[PDB]
A paper describes a structure:
Oxidized BpsDsbA was co-crystallized with 2 in a crystallization solution that typically generated crystals of the apoprotein, that is 200 mM Li2SO4, 100 mM HEPES pH 7.5, 29.5% PEG 3350. A crystal was harvested and diffracted to a resolution of 2.3 Å with space group P21 and unit-cell parameters a = 69.4, b = 59.4 , c = 105.4 Å, α = γ = 90, β = 104.9°. As such they were modelled as alternative conformations of the same molecule (with occupancies of 0.43 and 0.31). Similarly, we modelled Arg74 of chain B (Arg74-B) with two conformations which differ depending on the presence or absence of fragment 2 in orientation B (binding near the Tyr110 side chain of chain B). The two orientations A and B of fragment 2 sit in an almost completely closed pocket at the interface of protein chains A and B.
Disulfide-bond-forming protein A (DsbA) catalyzes the formation of the disulfide bonds necessary for the activity and stability of multiple substrate proteins, including many virulence factors. DsbA works in tandem with its membrane-embedded partner protein DsbB, which is required to maintain DsbA in its active, oxidized state. B. pseudomallei is a Gram-negative bacterium that is found predominantly in tropical areas and is the causative agent of the deadly disease melioidosis. Binding was characterized using NMR and X-ray crystallo­graphy. Both 1 and 2 bind to a transient (or ‘cryptic’) pocket on BpsDsbA located adjacent to the redox active site which is not observed in the apo BpsDsbA structure.
Author numbering: 9 to 197
Write the structure that this text describes.
Amino acid sequence: SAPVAGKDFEVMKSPQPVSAPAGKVEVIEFFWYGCPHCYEFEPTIEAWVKKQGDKIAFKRVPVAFRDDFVPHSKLFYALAALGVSEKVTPAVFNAIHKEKNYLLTPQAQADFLATQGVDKKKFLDAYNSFSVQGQVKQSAELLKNYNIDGVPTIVVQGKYKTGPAYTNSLEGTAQVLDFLVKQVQDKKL
């Protein structure tokens, strides 16, 4: 059955500006390294994004629901600043969820990433950079702008939100996302 508006996805009363160009559908994944659903969803969203390719503009935004997890948002943007996000991120998820290493401090992050081939000094310089600080503050602003209260949350074209909170299953989130993107492409949404 086709997804329904209000149950399987939410039409934001205040849509946000989309960064994707014309011809591409913007897809934003609000996630948290420590959220088990986000870890469980990673392979699904990765494959789906790669399959879509030039049809979408995918980005992730880290979420720090409490102050304790701001270091995870700094980690996200620090890995991006170093250009090693795609490579070491699976090890980051594994460290948090399977090795009981929650990577909650810059030092623990640096040590672990050192075991993954990342120079401690370069990573810490990125972690404490003003640019990463600004990106983290911006990610909090976006959490507010999109009215995100849970993760993982998928936002399509800055207007339609979905996720396991709406679909009760990660597969359901994927199916709704694919539907939403295709609806936007056909100009039906």
